[PDB]
């Protein structure tokens, strides 16, 4: 319900963008991923409507670089591209898909702690907005590679702000124990940027920072912004101007439908206001965010038919043709996902929903109360648009699921399922094993 | 070093089956999975040898049903198939692979808590040794399906013995709160078997049981065998004879070279000795085991070239082209894997190894002591032959890696890598989005 603005219940049946979920499952088979085109438009517009304030009080641009790793299906990236959205790519493959999705290079940022010469060349030739440099080793490579191409590479800098360990314990730890960014306090971030300014084939264009994911509190974001901006003034004091300020992504999603969490609006006010408090010290730069889950998560639903009902002395198990290989979130993090029966019964019942993989962790939900589950029913799991198909695999020799896009134009198969032949399409038997 | 019987360090260089690891990396590229054919033969032979005692003392067969879910690369199954190994499949795709690998049907067992009608038809048509029935609901389906097909389905029953909570807490809680098997204590197992004996299209072949994975203690296997055999005795007093007894897999492998673990010999002595104690109450049946990890794990090595060396104020990172999407174990279970520099340097240093994915969990190991790491070196992470490629994915839009098999005949490519074209090979853009 909360966050799922395009779904409803017409006459005891679940609907996605007006389409009958049970019928979709019957038409395209199961397991089936269902992405809502409208929901994506809604999630994107909210980010635009809530940040339009930035191109009024600063006269600068606000760019939304969608984090491809959340879902890089061609049809989806294509759709986001058409909406004028940007792209946050983190590998040669995402850059490849981004460019194929017709996403303007001026709206493309490249992240990653291990960028290969191959990926760098791709970024330079494509003339992406910026290379969110992660280390000095990366800068030296980019610069040396641009020299080779005879071109100039745009470089931002992923920094780890001097966050206060007391106020935000986790944010501080995450920025200091991980592999990303250039530490500010130690003077490495400064060392890097200054090192770049003296190179002839790189063009410093900004700074970047990403503090986490699924954060349902503006506090960390306010703190991040402040510490990042504090570094910008420190740069100005050295005679270094920043064109762009990328604060990454990580805004939580309404997985739990009982409690209300911060919206794009709340996040906008927090950042915008914090930013403005520096309207004097430094020129207000372009603002960039790299939302992933907060753009596609609530648009995806996974449908799975129940093939068996197993009753045990302590639990009532509902077995569905959907498994952890199709959607890894539950089994990997024990994370919560709302689950319901696409058919409304005049009776409730507490059960556990599991997949068919021979892995104990292959469970979608426990002790969930749903309308009487019956063999043949189609259950639906919410919020699988982000980190669902993008992390899907063939564990237990199972092909990845089909994907359909529901739009006002109709329902379209945006991803075909894999057959048994696909499972072995990359395998080769040596001669002595034939 | 422990368990890795086909690798060595010759001239300050790491070798797999006599093949220069660095050269393999140069030739086939990185990231690269390297499977040792001889190691797999050794692991398999260790089981056959340790259990040869069974047929010599009962005249019955001892069958090894390799668990495909640990690794079902066509070449690997093809290899085990030629060794006379059996197959423990849990999906239509695994049965499909098993049958294409020329594994005899009388050496194939099918496990799974959610076997679909489609898969059951496949198992029946193939006349597999047995369906390891996971629930009464599955039993009815199998029988009904065999009926419509006008054939008989061989079935065994996966039971969950009433393991003592105090003794082995983890093992106990699993056989009670998980979705697998038929509860013994509550009488469900007995009920299912008695029920099967009435059906006209099923053939009761035996009992099955699987207690866990990566078990480095012989104690749990003894308890399993005893409680399984006690149940068999109960069936005997009910006039029900048991042809096969499948005790599943679970034997752990030496990820840690520091600790000594049980061998196949310790397992056989534990199982066979316990089994023979029932020779006076019941006729000794065929013995089946479903080794997965203990057959291929130590045969796999993942090679990753270092592209950058990042030095933070606290940790010295080494970024390689091998990522968690290639081998999900570290990032997913925070499990330990031995890692070394294929090149022996005259001095060592402590470093942390990370992949290129933008996910903080994408770290292979922290604070490891390796020979001086230098850009361009090739690192090797041990014991990735099981639950490695089988769990690989394309997270961050990265295709799964290449795999080579090293044998006495030479080194051959057994899995081709995925290109950027492969990543979208299943994606389809709808008309309004072209
Ligand atoms: O801050 C980072 O880079 C690491 C976390 C990223 C989110 C990935 C998966 C999420 C899920 O299943 O909820
Ligand atoms: O009990 C089961 O059905 C399955 C266990 C598989 C875990 C895989 C790899 C990680 C590890 O080594 O613990």
């Amino acid at each position: 319900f909360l966050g799922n603005d395009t779904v409803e219940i017409k006459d005891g049946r679940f609907f996605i963008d007006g389409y009958d979920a049970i019928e979709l499952a019957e038409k395209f088979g199961t397991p089936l991923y269902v992405m809502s085109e409208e929901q994506i438009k809604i999630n994107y517009n909210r980010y635009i409507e809530a940040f339009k304030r930035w191109e009024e009080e600063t006269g600068k641009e606000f760019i939304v670089a969608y984090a491809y790793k959340a879902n890089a299906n061609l049809a989806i990236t294509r759709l986001l591209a058409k909406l004028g959205c940007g792209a946050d790519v983190v590998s040669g493959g995402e850059l490849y898909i981004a460019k194929l999705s017709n996403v303007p290079s001026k709206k493309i940022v490249f992240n990653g702690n291990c960028k290969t010469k191959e990926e760098i060349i791709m970024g330079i030739e494509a003339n992406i907005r910026a290379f969110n440099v992660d280390s000095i080793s990366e800068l030296i490579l980019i610069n040396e590679t641009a020299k080779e191409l005879g071109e100039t590479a745009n470089v931002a800098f992923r920094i780890n702000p001097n966050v206060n360990p007391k106020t935000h314990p986790k944010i501080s730890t995450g920025l200091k124990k991980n592999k990303f960014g250039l530490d500010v306090e130690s003077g490495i971030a400064m060392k890097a940027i200054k090192m770049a300014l003296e190179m002839e084939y790189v063009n410093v264009v900004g700074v970047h920072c990403h503090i986490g994911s699924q954060l349902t509190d503006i506090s960390p974001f306010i703190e991040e912004t402040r510490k990042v901006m504090d570094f910008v003034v420190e740069l100005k004091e050295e005679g270094i101007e920043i064109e762009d300020v990328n604060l990454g992504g990580g805004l939580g999603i309404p997985y739990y439908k009982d409690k209300q969490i911060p919206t794009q609006k709340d996040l906008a006010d927090a950042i915008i206001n914090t930013m403005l408090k520096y309207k004097d010290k430094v020129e207000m730069p372009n603002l960039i965010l790299e939302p992933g889950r907060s753009l596609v998560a609530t648009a995806g639903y996974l449908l799975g038919k129940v093939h068996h009902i197993k009753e045990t002395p302590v639990t009532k198990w509902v077995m569905i043709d959907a498994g952890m290989n199709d959607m890894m979130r539950p089994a990997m993090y024990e994370a919560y996902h709302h689950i319901i029966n696409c058919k409304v019964k005049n009776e409730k019942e507490v059960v556990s929903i599991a997949g068919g993989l021979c892995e104990s962790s292959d469970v979608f939900g426990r002790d969930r109360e749903l309308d009487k589950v019956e063999v043949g029913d189609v259950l639906a799991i919410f919020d699988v648009g982000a980190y669902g198909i993008s992390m899907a695999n063939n564990y237990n020799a199972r092909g990845r699921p089909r994907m359909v896009l529901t739009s006002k134009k109709g329902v379209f198969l945006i991803r075909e399922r894999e057959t048994y032949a696909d499972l072995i399409a990359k395998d080769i038997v040596p001669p002595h094993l034939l």
Side-chain angles (χ1 to χ4, degrees), chain A residues 69 158 180 210-213 255 293 329 333 335 387 391:
Chain A
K69 59 180 233 246
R158 182 172 182 164
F180 312 111
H210 182 254
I211 61 170
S213 178
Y255 284 119
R293 191 197 311 285
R329 192 160 188 281
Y333 311 100
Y387 306 108
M391 303 200 301

Coordinates of all heavy atoms in Angstrom, one line a residue, chain A residues 69 158 180 210-213 255 293 329 333 335 387 391, ligand 1:
Chain A
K69 N 22.9 -0.2 -10.9 CA 23.0 -1.5 -10.2 C 21.7 -1.9 -9.5 O 21.5 -3.1 -9.2 CB 24.1 -1.4 -9.2 CG 24.0 -0.4 -8.1 CD 25.2 -0.4 -7.2 CE 24.8 -0.5 -5.7 NZ 25.3 0.7 -4.9
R158 N 35.4 11.1 -5.0 CA 34.6 10.5 -4.0 C 35.4 10.7 -2.7 O 36.5 10.2 -2.6 CB 34.3 9.0 -4.3 CG 33.4 8.3 -3.2 CD 33.1 6.9 -3.6 NE 32.2 6.3 -2.6 CZ 31.4 5.2 -2.8 NH1 31.4 4.6 -4.0 NH2 30.6 4.8 -1.8
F180 N 35.9 2.4 -0.3 CA 35.6 3.6 -1.1 C 36.2 4.9 -0.7 O 36.8 5.0 0.4 CB 34.1 3.8 -1.2 CG 33.4 2.5 -1.6 CD1 32.5 1.9 -0.7 CD2 33.5 2.0 -2.9 CE1 31.8 0.8 -1.0 CE2 32.8 0.9 -3.2 CZ 31.9 0.2 -2.3
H210 N 28.9 9.1 -1.1 CA 27.8 8.2 -0.9 C 27.9 7.5 0.5 O 28.9 6.8 0.7 CB 27.8 7.1 -2.0 CG 26.6 6.1 -1.9 ND1 26.7 4.8 -1.4 CD2 25.3 6.3 -2.1 CE1 25.6 4.3 -1.4 NE2 24.7 5.1 -1.8
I211 N 27.0 7.8 1.4 CA 27.0 7.3 2.7 C 26.3 6.0 3.1 O 26.5 5.5 4.2 CB 26.4 8.4 3.7 CG1 24.9 8.7 3.3 CG2 27.2 9.7 3.7 CD1 24.2 9.5 4.3
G212 N 25.5 5.5 2.2 CA 24.8 4.3 2.6 C 23.6 4.0 1.8 O 23.4 4.6 0.7
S213 N 22.8 3.0 2.2 CA 21.6 2.6 1.5 C 20.5 2.2 2.5 O 20.7 1.8 3.6 CB 21.9 1.4 0.6 OG 20.7 1.0 -0.1
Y255 N 9.4 -0.5 2.7 CA 9.2 -1.9 2.7 C 8.2 -2.3 3.7 O 7.3 -3.1 3.5 CB 10.6 -2.6 3.1 CG 11.6 -2.7 1.9 CD1 12.8 -2.1 2.0 CD2 11.3 -3.3 0.7 CE1 13.7 -2.1 1.0 CE2 12.2 -3.3 -0.3 CZ 13.4 -2.7 -0.2 OH 14.3 -2.6 -1.2
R293 N 17.3 2.5 -5.3 CA 16.1 1.8 -4.7 C 14.9 2.8 -4.7 O 13.8 2.4 -4.9 CB 16.4 1.4 -3.3 CG 15.4 0.5 -2.7 CD 15.7 0.4 -1.2 NE 17.1 0.2 -0.8 CZ 17.7 -1.0 -0.9 NH1 17.0 -2.0 -1.3 NH2 19.0 -1.1 -0.6
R329 N 17.0 -10.8 -2.2 CA 16.9 -10.0 -1.0 C 16.6 -10.7 0.3 O 17.3 -10.7 1.3 CB 16.0 -8.8 -1.3 CG 16.0 -7.8 -0.2 CD 15.5 -6.4 -0.7 NE 15.7 -5.4 0.3 CZ 15.0 -5.2 1.4 NH1 13.9 -6.0 1.6 NH2 15.3 -4.3 2.3
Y333 N 19.7 -11.1 3.1 CA 19.7 -10.2 4.3 C 18.6 -10.4 5.3 O 18.6 -9.7 6.3 CB 19.6 -8.7 3.7 CG 20.5 -8.4 2.6 CD1 20.1 -8.4 1.3 CD2 21.9 -8.0 2.8 CE1 20.9 -8.1 0.2 CE2 22.7 -7.7 1.8 CZ 22.2 -7.7 0.5 OH 23.1 -7.4 -0.6
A335 N 15.8 -9.6 4.9 CA 15.1 -8.4 4.7 C 13.6 -8.6 4.5 O 13.2 -9.7 4.0 CB 15.6 -7.5 3.6
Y387 N 17.3 -4.1 -6.9 CA 18.0 -5.2 -6.4 C 17.2 -6.5 -6.4 O 17.3 -7.3 -5.5 CB 18.5 -4.9 -5.0 CG 19.2 -3.5 -5.0 CD1 18.6 -2.4 -4.4 CD2 20.5 -3.4 -5.5 CE1 19.3 -1.2 -4.4 CE2 21.1 -2.1 -5.6 CZ 20.5 -1.0 -5.0 OH 21.1 0.2 -5.1
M391 N 20.2 -8.9 -9.2 CA 21.0 -9.8 -8.4 C 20.5 -11.3 -8.6 O 21.0 -12.2 -7.9 CB 20.9 -9.5 -6.9 CG 21.3 -8.0 -6.6 SD 21.8 -7.8 -4.9 CE 20.2 -8.3 -4.0
Ligands
LIG1 O1 26.3 1.5 0.7 C1 26.7 0.5 -0.1 O2 27.4 0.7 -1.2 C2 26.3 -0.9 0.2 C3 24.8 -1.2 0.2 C4 24.0 -1.3 -1.1 C5 22.6 -1.8 -1.3 C6 22.5 -3.2 -2.0 C7 21.4 -4.3 -1.7 C8 20.2 -4.2 -0.8 C9 18.9 -4.9 -0.3 O3 18.7 -6.1 -0.5 O4 18.1 -4.2 0.5

